[PDB]
Amino acid sequence: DLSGKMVKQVEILSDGIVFYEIFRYRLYLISEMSPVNIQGVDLLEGNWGTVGSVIFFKYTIDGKEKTAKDIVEAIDEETKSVTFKIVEGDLMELYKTFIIIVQVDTKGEHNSVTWTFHYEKLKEDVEEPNTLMNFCIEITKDIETYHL
């Protein structure tokens, strides 16, 4: 009914490991790398790149400035995956819950990044998050090109 799930995978020409490392550790870099979408990232709790570390995001979606408070909820070094739960901010006005997993395929010649959302809507007339997903693909591209 209200639960839902959205997945996109996009190939990256840059290096997959360095990509992963950004989302795991140096997440304070998405600003310099995709400035248009991400105004700032602060670390509120714990250390960069730990499960349970809590981050505030200042970002822009379609010319509307927004805020998210996330908590890193899992890391898998083996599948180069890192999950984020969204606990406060503009999305929480549309969704009861929202998880974002970013997973990177770094084996072989061709590297990829898969984005997965898991979410539950407050109501049925709340919209599927394609705008958020386009937002992500877009950041993914910025990072890919940044110094290329």
Swiss-Prot record:
InterPro entries: Bet_v_I/MLP, MLP-like_ligand-binding, START-like_dom_sf
Entry annotated with the keyword Acetylation: yes
UniProt keyword terms in alphabetical order: Acetylation, Allergen
Single GO biological process annotation from the record: defense response
PTM text: The N-terminus is blocked.
Nucleotide-binding found in the keyword field: no
Pfam families: Bet_v_1 (PF00407)
Subunit structure: Monomer.
Family: Belongs to the MLP family.
Name under which the protein is recorded: Kirola
Record organism: Actinidia deliciosa (Kiwi)
